[PDB]
PDB file of C-alpha atoms in Angstrom:
ATOM      1  CA  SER Q   4       0.000   0.000   0.000  1.00  0.00           C
ATOM      2  CA  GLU Q   5       1.200   3.413   1.098  1.00  0.00           C
ATOM      3  CA  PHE Q   6       1.658   3.408   4.884  1.00  0.00           C
ATOM      4  CA  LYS Q   7       5.369   3.614   5.964  1.00  0.00           C
ATOM      5  CA  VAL Q   8       7.575   4.689   8.900  1.00  0.00           C
ATOM      6  CA  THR Q   9      11.192   5.263   9.672  1.00  0.00           C
ATOM      7  CA  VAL Q  10      12.736   3.690  12.771  1.00  0.00           C
ATOM      8  CA  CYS Q  11      15.978   4.938  14.384  1.00  0.00           C
ATOM      9  CA  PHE Q  12      18.232   2.304  15.890  1.00  0.00           C
ATOM     10  CA  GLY Q  13      20.801   4.662  17.337  1.00  0.00           C
ATOM     11  CA  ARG Q  14      21.911   6.847  14.430  1.00  0.00           C
ATOM     12  CA  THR Q  15      21.064   4.258  11.769  1.00  0.00           C
ATOM     13  CA  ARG Q  16      17.556   4.762  10.416  1.00  0.00           C
ATOM     14  CA  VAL Q  17      15.345   2.268   8.692  1.00  0.00           C
ATOM     15  CA  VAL Q  18      12.334   2.587   6.386  1.00  0.00           C
ATOM     16  CA  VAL Q  19       9.644   0.024   7.018  1.00  0.00           C
ATOM     17  CA  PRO Q  20       6.603  -0.465   4.759  1.00  0.00           C
ATOM     18  CA  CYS Q  21       3.419  -1.043   6.792  1.00  0.00           C
ATOM     19  CA  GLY Q  22       1.022  -1.462   3.846  1.00  0.00           C
ATOM     20  CA  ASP Q  23      -2.275  -1.015   5.638  1.00  0.00           C
ATOM     21  CA  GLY Q  24      -1.115   0.915   8.776  1.00  0.00           C
ATOM     22  CA  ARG Q  25      -3.415  -1.487  10.728  1.00  0.00           C
ATOM     23  CA  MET Q  26      -0.434  -3.512  12.053  1.00  0.00           C
ATOM     24  CA  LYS Q  27       0.231  -3.706  15.873  1.00  0.00           C
ATOM     25  CA  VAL Q  28       3.314  -2.033  17.424  1.00  0.00           C
ATOM     26  CA  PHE Q  29       4.914  -5.473  18.233  1.00  0.00           C
ATOM     27  CA  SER Q  30       4.615  -6.520  14.529  1.00  0.00           C
ATOM     28  CA  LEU Q  31       6.260  -3.284  13.516  1.00  0.00           C
ATOM     29  CA  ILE Q  32       9.046  -3.864  16.005  1.00  0.00           C
ATOM     30  CA  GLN Q  33      10.093  -7.156  14.438  1.00  0.00           C
ATOM     31  CA  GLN Q  34       9.878  -5.712  10.929  1.00  0.00           C
ATOM     32  CA  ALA Q  35      12.159  -2.927  11.975  1.00  0.00           C
ATOM     33  CA  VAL Q  36      14.679  -5.332  13.430  1.00  0.00           C
ATOM     34  CA  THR Q  37      14.839  -7.548  10.308  1.00  0.00           C
ATOM     35  CA  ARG Q  38      15.825  -4.543   8.195  1.00  0.00           C
ATOM     36  CA  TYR Q  39      18.204  -3.058  10.683  1.00  0.00           C
ATOM     37  CA  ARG Q  40      19.850  -6.518  10.870  1.00  0.00           C
ATOM     38  CA  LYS Q  41      20.335  -6.349   7.082  1.00  0.00           C
ATOM     39  CA  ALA Q  42      21.689  -2.820   7.194  1.00  0.00           C
ATOM     40  CA  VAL Q  43      24.269  -3.261   9.826  1.00  0.00           C
ATOM     41  CA  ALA Q  44      26.240  -6.560   9.707  1.00  0.00           C
ATOM     42  CA  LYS Q  45      27.093  -9.282  10.459  1.00  0.00           C
ATOM     43  CA  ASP Q  46      28.776 -10.977  13.443  1.00  0.00           C
ATOM     44  CA  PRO Q  47      28.210 -14.785  14.003  1.00  0.00           C
ATOM     45  CA  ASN Q  48      26.669 -14.404  17.513  1.00  0.00           C
ATOM     46  CA  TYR Q  49      24.863 -11.055  17.006  1.00  0.00           C
ATOM     47  CA  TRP Q  50      21.675 -10.303  18.906  1.00  0.00           C
ATOM     48  CA  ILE Q  51      19.267  -7.467  19.259  1.00  0.00           C
ATOM     49  CA  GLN Q  52      16.789  -6.754  22.080  1.00  0.00           C
ATOM     50  CA  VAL Q  53      14.168  -4.088  21.624  1.00  0.00           C
ATOM     51  CA  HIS Q  54      12.705  -2.651  24.783  1.00  0.00           C
ATOM     52  CA  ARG Q  55      10.375  -0.041  23.362  1.00  0.00           C
ATOM     53  CA  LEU Q  56       9.505   2.216  20.388  1.00  0.00           C
ATOM     54  CA  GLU Q  57       8.996   5.976  20.942  1.00  0.00           C
ATOM     55  CA  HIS Q  58       8.091   9.224  19.252  1.00  0.00           C
ATOM     56  CA  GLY Q  59      10.865  11.785  19.160  1.00  0.00           C
ATOM     57  CA  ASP Q  60       9.123  13.019  22.368  1.00  0.00           C
ATOM     58  CA  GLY Q  61       9.990   9.889  24.286  1.00  0.00           C
ATOM     59  CA  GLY Q  62       6.239   9.286  23.934  1.00  0.00           C
ATOM     60  CA  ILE Q  63       5.977   5.543  24.451  1.00  0.00           C
ATOM     61  CA  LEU Q  64       4.001   3.350  21.986  1.00  0.00           C
ATOM     62  CA  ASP Q  65       2.028   0.488  23.520  1.00  0.00           C
ATOM     63  CA  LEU Q  66       2.904  -2.920  22.080  1.00  0.00           C
ATOM     64  CA  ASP Q  67      -0.655  -3.904  21.324  1.00  0.00           C
ATOM     65  CA  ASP Q  68      -1.775  -0.627  19.778  1.00  0.00           C
ATOM     66  CA  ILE Q  69      -2.613  -0.431  16.060  1.00  0.00           C
ATOM     67  CA  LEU Q  70       0.059   1.632  14.322  1.00  0.00           C
ATOM     68  CA  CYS Q  71      -1.927   4.251  12.420  1.00  0.00           C
ATOM     69  CA  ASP Q  72      -3.802   5.060  15.654  1.00  0.00           C
ATOM     70  CA  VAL Q  73      -0.567   5.738  17.542  1.00  0.00           C
ATOM     71  CA  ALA Q  74       1.487   7.362  14.816  1.00  0.00           C
ATOM     72  CA  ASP Q  75       1.230   9.094  11.424  1.00  0.00           C
ATOM     73  CA  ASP Q  76       2.322   8.062   7.952  1.00  0.00           C
ATOM     74  CA  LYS Q  77       6.032   8.700   7.539  1.00  0.00           C
ATOM     75  CA  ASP Q  78       6.804   9.310  11.242  1.00  0.00           C
ATOM     76  CA  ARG Q  79      10.360   9.053  12.597  1.00  0.00           C
ATOM     77  CA  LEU Q  80      10.346   6.679  15.618  1.00  0.00           C
ATOM     78  CA  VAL Q  81      13.218   5.796  17.938  1.00  0.00           C
ATOM     79  CA  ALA Q  82      13.975   2.303  19.266  1.00  0.00           C
ATOM     80  CA  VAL Q  83      15.305   1.788  22.811  1.00  0.00           C
ATOM     81  CA  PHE Q  84      17.272  -1.459  22.426  1.00  0.00           C
ATOM     82  CA  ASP Q  85      20.370  -3.560  23.095  1.00  0.00           C
ATOM     83  CA  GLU Q  86      22.625  -5.522  20.631  1.00  0.00           C
ATOM     84  CA  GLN Q  87      25.890  -7.438  19.774  1.00  0.00           C
TER      85      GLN Q  87
ATOM     86  CA  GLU H   5       4.492   6.625 -14.887  1.00  0.00           C
ATOM     87  CA  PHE H   6       6.182   6.409 -11.404  1.00  0.00           C
ATOM     88  CA  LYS H   7       9.744   7.912 -11.126  1.00  0.00           C
ATOM     89  CA  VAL H   8      12.488   9.002  -8.733  1.00  0.00           C
ATOM     90  CA  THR H   9      15.709  11.052  -8.661  1.00  0.00           C
ATOM     91  CA  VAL H  10      18.867   9.343  -7.400  1.00  0.00           C
ATOM     92  CA  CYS H  11      21.838  11.319  -5.977  1.00  0.00           C
ATOM     93  CA  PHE H  12      25.352  10.287  -6.810  1.00  0.00           C
ATOM     94  CA  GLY H  13      27.202  13.036  -5.062  1.00  0.00           C
ATOM     95  CA  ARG H  14      26.131  16.198  -6.755  1.00  0.00           C
ATOM     96  CA  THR H  15      24.979  14.608  -9.977  1.00  0.00           C
ATOM     97  CA  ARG H  16      21.255  13.929  -9.942  1.00  0.00           C
ATOM     98  CA  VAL H  17      19.809  11.414 -12.355  1.00  0.00           C
ATOM     99  CA  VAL H  18      16.092  10.750 -13.123  1.00  0.00           C
ATOM    100  CA  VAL H  19      14.991   7.073 -13.294  1.00  0.00           C
ATOM    101  CA  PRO H  20      11.552   5.873 -14.580  1.00  0.00           C
ATOM    102  CA  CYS H  21       9.947   2.997 -12.685  1.00  0.00           C
ATOM    103  CA  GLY H  22       6.804   1.965 -14.546  1.00  0.00           C
ATOM    104  CA  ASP H  23       4.419   1.554 -11.598  1.00  0.00           C
ATOM    105  CA  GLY H  24       7.048   1.523  -8.789  1.00  0.00           C
ATOM    106  CA  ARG H  25       6.528  -2.197  -8.106  1.00  0.00           C
ATOM    107  CA  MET H  26      10.189  -2.974  -8.816  1.00  0.00           C
ATOM    108  CA  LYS H  27      12.580  -3.889  -5.968  1.00  0.00           C
ATOM    109  CA  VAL H  28      14.978  -1.377  -4.355  1.00  0.00           C
ATOM    110  CA  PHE H  29      17.840  -3.366  -5.904  1.00  0.00           C
ATOM    111  CA  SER H  30      16.358  -2.998  -9.484  1.00  0.00           C
ATOM    112  CA  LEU H  31      16.264   0.723  -8.887  1.00  0.00           C
ATOM    113  CA  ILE H  32      19.999   0.665  -8.156  1.00  0.00           C
ATOM    114  CA  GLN H  33      20.801  -1.176 -11.400  1.00  0.00           C
ATOM    115  CA  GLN H  34      18.744   1.425 -13.284  1.00  0.00           C
ATOM    116  CA  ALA H  35      20.413   4.378 -11.529  1.00  0.00           C
ATOM    117  CA  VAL H  36      24.018   3.256 -11.772  1.00  0.00           C
ATOM    118  CA  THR H  37      23.554   2.723 -15.530  1.00  0.00           C
ATOM    119  CA  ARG H  38      22.038   6.107 -16.055  1.00  0.00           C
ATOM    120  CA  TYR H  39      24.644   7.852 -13.865  1.00  0.00           C
ATOM    121  CA  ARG H  40      27.465   6.199 -15.818  1.00  0.00           C
ATOM    122  CA  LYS H  41      26.081   7.729 -19.024  1.00  0.00           C
ATOM    123  CA  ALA H  42      25.507  11.201 -17.493  1.00  0.00           C
ATOM    124  CA  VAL H  43      29.135  11.606 -16.352  1.00  0.00           C
ATOM    125  CA  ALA H  44      30.843   8.896 -18.568  1.00  0.00           C
ATOM    126  CA  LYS H  45      33.858   8.635 -16.233  1.00  0.00           C
ATOM    127  CA  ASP H  46      36.019   5.942 -17.928  1.00  0.00           C
ATOM    128  CA  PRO H  47      36.193   2.691 -19.920  1.00  0.00           C
ATOM    129  CA  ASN H  48      37.823   1.170 -16.725  1.00  0.00           C
ATOM    130  CA  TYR H  49      35.935   3.088 -13.911  1.00  0.00           C
ATOM    131  CA  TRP H  50      34.232   0.744 -11.369  1.00  0.00           C
ATOM    132  CA  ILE H  51      31.294   1.478  -9.037  1.00  0.00           C
ATOM    133  CA  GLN H  52      29.705   0.057  -5.856  1.00  0.00           C
ATOM    134  CA  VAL H  53      26.549   1.376  -4.259  1.00  0.00           C
ATOM    135  CA  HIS H  54      26.172   0.283  -0.675  1.00  0.00           C
ATOM    136  CA  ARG H  55      22.791   1.669   0.196  1.00  0.00           C
ATOM    137  CA  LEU H  56      19.970   3.914  -0.939  1.00  0.00           C
ATOM    138  CA  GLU H  57      18.762   6.657   1.480  1.00  0.00           C
ATOM    139  CA  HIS H  58      16.030   9.268   1.772  1.00  0.00           C
ATOM    140  CA  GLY H  59      16.887  12.794   2.838  1.00  0.00           C
ATOM    141  CA  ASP H  60      16.648  11.916   6.566  1.00  0.00           C
ATOM    142  CA  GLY H  61      19.047   9.048   6.167  1.00  0.00           C
ATOM    143  CA  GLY H  62      16.258   6.476   6.079  1.00  0.00           C
ATOM    144  CA  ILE H  63      17.646   3.271   4.584  1.00  0.00           C
ATOM    145  CA  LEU H  64      15.519   1.540   1.967  1.00  0.00           C
ATOM    146  CA  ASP H  65      15.791  -2.268   2.095  1.00  0.00           C
ATOM    147  CA  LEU H  66      16.916  -3.895  -1.160  1.00  0.00           C
ATOM    148  CA  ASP H  67      14.151  -6.477  -1.315  1.00  0.00           C
ATOM    149  CA  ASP H  68      11.311  -4.035  -0.617  1.00  0.00           C
ATOM    150  CA  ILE H  69       8.937  -2.803  -3.343  1.00  0.00           C
ATOM    151  CA  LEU H  70       9.835   0.745  -4.280  1.00  0.00           C
ATOM    152  CA  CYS H  71       6.368   2.394  -4.246  1.00  0.00           C
ATOM    153  CA  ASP H  72       6.047   0.826  -0.772  1.00  0.00           C
ATOM    154  CA  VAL H  73       9.121   2.451   0.680  1.00  0.00           C
ATOM    155  CA  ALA H  74       9.227   5.685  -1.311  1.00  0.00           C
ATOM    156  CA  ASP H  75       6.834   8.145  -3.001  1.00  0.00           C
ATOM    157  CA  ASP H  76       6.461   9.063  -6.628  1.00  0.00           C
ATOM    158  CA  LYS H  77       8.904  11.818  -7.503  1.00  0.00           C
ATOM    159  CA  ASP H  78      10.987  11.348  -4.293  1.00  0.00           C
ATOM    160  CA  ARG H  79      14.612  12.480  -4.236  1.00  0.00           C
ATOM    161  CA  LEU H  80      17.009   9.744  -3.022  1.00  0.00           C
ATOM    162  CA  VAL H  81      20.678   9.844  -2.049  1.00  0.00           C
ATOM    163  CA  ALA H  82      22.974   6.987  -3.131  1.00  0.00           C
ATOM    164  CA  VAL H  83      25.760   5.959  -0.758  1.00  0.00           C
ATOM    165  CA  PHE H  84      28.422   4.534  -3.004  1.00  0.00           C
ATOM    166  CA  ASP H  85      32.094   4.112  -3.830  1.00  0.00           C
ATOM    167  CA  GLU H  86      34.041   5.062  -7.011  1.00  0.00           C
TER     168      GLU H  86
END
């Protein structure tokens, strides 16, 4: 479809297609990770743990909330996460 | 009639996409080719494009549909080596 967002892992930023927009925050989160994984490389025992997604505010998005209800098309969103 | 501009440094090239249903990697093939022509650097000259960004720095994944990840007439920056 049309609906899309960018997600900041640290300084690296990743565009995720959300077709609908009707996807739950937790679905989004995984989708963001997959792409980030691809963008960043590549260590044999790598791992990433996402704690939460936010607005630039620090406004915290509930995991079970529909995306288009909690954000707008083409919003920048930050991930609070760990990795390596 | 979907289309995008790709930025190779300061040179901007316009690529047609049909409907925009082509992958982000297809785009890159299209853009390299066109950019080669527009500056015609060398018979030997080699080029590698690492990633495609939006203005913000928003990476576009290679296996994603273009019209899904970008908008008609968007301006995109190529991150590349030459």
